[PDB]
Amino acid sequence: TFVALYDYESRTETDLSFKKGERLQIVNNTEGDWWLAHSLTTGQTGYIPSNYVAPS
């Protein structure tokens, strides 16, 4: 249960650009870098920046 600090505006389709206030389920990468989170709404996979996310 993390939180999207900001709305990472990715530019490539590889990473999906999420937003702040939306719920995301972290996937891997525990350190601080670019962990991949999966949205529970549709079920897409987007790399949310660690600086743009935070453990609740």
- Long-range contacts of 20-25, Cβ-Cβ distance < 8 Å, separation of 24 or more: 24/48, 24/53, 25/1
Question: What is the identity of the amino acid at 43?
Answer: G
Q: Which CATH number do you get for residue 2? A: 2.30.30.40
Domain extent for 43: 1-56
Q: φ, ψ for residue 19 (rounded to 5)?
A: -145, 175
- Is residue 50 within 8 Å of residue 6, measured between CB atoms? no
At 11, is the secondary structure helix, strand, or coil? coil
Question: What is the identity of the amino acid at 53?
Answer: V
Hey, how many other C-beta atoms are within 10 angstroms of the C-beta on 8? 20
Method: NMR
Environment class of 47 (CB within 10 Å of its CB; exposed 0-12, middle 13-18, buried 19+): buried
Number of structural domains the chain divides into? 1
